Structure 1
Amino acid sequence: MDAIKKKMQMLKLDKENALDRAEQAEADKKAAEDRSKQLEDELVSLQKKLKGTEDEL
Structure 2
Amino acid sequence: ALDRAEQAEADKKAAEDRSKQLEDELVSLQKKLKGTEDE
**TM over 0.5, shorter chain:** yes
- Cα distance, 1:25 vs structure 2: 0.2
Deviations 1:10-46 (A, max 9, x none): xxxxxxxx21111100111111110011101111111
- Structure 1, unaligned runs of 5 or more: 1-17
Give the total of aligned pairs: 39
TM-score, normalization by structure 2: 0.79
Instruction: From the CA coordinates, give the structure whose radius of gyration is larger.
Output: 1
What RMSD, in angstroms, separates the aligned Cα atoms of the two structures? 1.0
Aligned identity (percent) is: 100
Q: Which runs of 5+ in 2 are unaligned?
A: none
